[PDB]
Structure 1
Amino acid sequence: MDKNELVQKAKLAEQAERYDDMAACMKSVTEQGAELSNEERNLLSVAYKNVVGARRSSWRVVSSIEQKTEGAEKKQQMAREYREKIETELRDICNDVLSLLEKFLIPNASQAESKVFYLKMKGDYYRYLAEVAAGDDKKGIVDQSQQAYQEAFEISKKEMQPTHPIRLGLALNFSVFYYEILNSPEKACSLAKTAFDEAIAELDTLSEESYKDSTLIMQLLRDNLTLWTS
């Protein structure tokens, strides 16, 4: 259909909380090949955050039940088979996002802000794959997440001020990758602490359009820091 008609149905789907419809319309917008506006970019990220977020949330519940039913064969086996059903949905969702990122979003990103946004997004959805990966393929999935974050990180440090919300949000999620995926609390804390401290050393650089997002993300960075130090 028309791009603008796809976008307004995605906005309709969002307010109806029909995030499958929302992702379907933003996936169609992306496949038309043109660079997404900042508004279209946010709509695609919100839609898939919610479609994958439902599976991640259900995965953690079922995985925790699987962990707490050791000694109860029937219940553990049902939880394990259900977890595997949920894992397949989760993997299909992130392969869908990661193929949009590699075919359209990253190669057509003309600005540094957009490159950092999508490289972080690429780091995010490989991290979601790493959350549920096991065996041989986990090492490669973890490396793909780390290298996506690492490239976004280098671009962000060279092109963005420390108070930029996209740079801060990337530092937040990269910090989480180190803690939860790489099981490295020092590196996680040191990344979150440096991002917080570098932002607070140049609060003059805060825009009024961004200051509330930037100050919230700073608070979230220090929340993880204080929880990872306890």
Structure 2
Amino acid sequence: GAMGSMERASLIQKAKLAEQAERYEDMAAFMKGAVEKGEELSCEERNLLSVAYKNVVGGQRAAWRVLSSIEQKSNEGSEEGPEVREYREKVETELQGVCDTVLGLLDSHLIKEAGDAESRVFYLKMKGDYYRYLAEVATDKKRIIDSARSAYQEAMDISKKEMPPTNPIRLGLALNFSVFHYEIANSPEEAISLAKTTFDEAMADLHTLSEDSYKDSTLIMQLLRDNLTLWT
């Protein structure tokens, strides 16, 4: 590991600098290095890891969608070479590599050492997210979908037992699981039901929250609401 010679604290400090500089490839490398030190991650450090790789993979998914669209148009009255397919495959292969890197970190060994709900649910959700990103480009497709489903479901079970309905991690988990149902699993009715009950159960729990926790939860709830508006 190219970050093996750098102090854990220095990697974290530089990941925060990279975030301010919007250098998310650097941020991912720093946080990967931090994870590979072997120590568990704090809540802040976990979110730095999530921020870095979500932005990296986020740019790859956007590029892949553009290229896939151009590729599908080429395969309709369309004039013909292999370049579009080749370059889409290049981005796709790079995207899959990032997803495998994250899944590798969760498997070695973030998840097995995560005992607390906030950490375990966070990592299992992340596992679901990155198997979902793999599913988006897959055509083993079924096993990838099942791996996402299984990760999300284990996370849902723990969050429902151990976290209040308004917990931001639980809310973000349910949001992404509902996206999985709608966009990946061809289960729009499951997606709508999950988003509804997640929103309603959080609504009924807002009265227990501080002003700052209320802002955090309602911000995420609005995404659930926005999706329901698009889905119904």
TM-score, structure 1 length as denominator? 0.95
The reply to whether residue 35 of structure 1 matches residue 40 of structure 2 is yes
DSSP-derived class of the 1:8 partner: helix
Q: 1:72 aligns with which of 49, 55, 78?
A: 78
CA contact under 8 A between 1:163 and 1:205: conserved in structure 2? Answer: no
Deviations 1:148-203 (A, max 9, x none): 00000000001111111111111100000000001111000000000001111221
Q: 2:172 aligns with which of 169, 173, 177?
A: 169
Worse-matched range after superposition: 52-61 or 13-22: 13-22
The reply to whether residue 23 of structure 1 matches residue 34 of structure 2 is no
Which residue type is aligned with residue 169 of structure 2? I
Tell me how far 1:73 sits from its aligned partner. Answer: 4.4
Deviations 1:25-81 (A, max 9, x none): 000000111011111111111000011111001011111122223243437x43222
CA contact under 8 A between 1:124 and 1:145: conserved in structure 2? Answer: yes
For residues 80 and 19 of structure 2, what CA distance do their matches in structure 1 show?
A: 39
DSSP-derived class of the 1:64 partner: helix
Tell me how far 1:18 sits from its aligned partner. Answer: 1.2
The reply to whether residue 180 of structure 1 matches residue 183 of structure 2 is yes
Deviations 1:13-34 (A, max 9, x none): 1111111111000000001110
Unaligned residue ranges in structure 1 (runs of 5+): none
Deviations 1:65-110 (A, max 9, x none): 22223243437x4322221111100010000000100112111113
Q: 1:153 aligns with which of 156, 164, 175?
A: 156
Worse-matched range after superposition: 189-198 or 12-21: 12-21
For residues 135 and 79 of structure 2, what CA distance do their matches in structure 1 show?
A: 27
CA contact under 8 A between 1:35 and 1:109: conserved in structure 2? Answer: yes
Which residue type is aligned with residue 197 of structure 2? T
Partner of 2:62: 57
Worse-matched range after superposition: 192-201 or 103-112: 103-112
Which residue type is aligned with residue 23 of structure 2? R
CA contact under 8 A between 1:19 and 1:47: conserved in structure 2? Answer: yes
Which residue type is aligned with residue 72 of structure 1? S
Which residue type is aligned with residue 65 of structure 2? R
For residues 112 and 181 of structure 1, what CA distance do their matches in structure 2 show?
A: 26
The reply to whether residue 220 of structure 1 matches residue 223 of structure 2 is yes
CA contact under 8 A between 1:6 and 1:26: conserved in structure 2? Answer: yes
For residues 7 and 44 of structure 2, what CA distance do their matches in structure 1 show?
A: 16
Deviations 1:128-167 (A, max 9, x none): 0000000xx1000000000000000000001111111111
Which residue type is aligned with residue 98 of structure 1? L
For residues 212 and 110 of structure 2, what CA distance do their matches in structure 1 show?
A: 25
CA contact under 8 A between 2:19 and 2:52: conserved in structure 1? Answer: yes
1:3-14 aligned within 5 A? 3-14=8-19
Worse-matched range after superposition: 61-70 or 14-23: 61-70
For residues 7 and 74 of structure 1, what CA distance do their matches in structure 2 show?
A: 49
The reply to whether residue 97 of structure 1 matches residue 99 of structure 2 is no
Rate the CA distance shift 1:79–1:207 in 2: closer, same or farther, 3 A.
farther
TM-score, structure 2 length as denominator? 0.94
For residues 84 and 42 of structure 1, what CA distance do their matches in structure 2 show?
A: 30
DSSP-derived class of the 1:107 partner: helix
Identity, in percent, stands at: 73
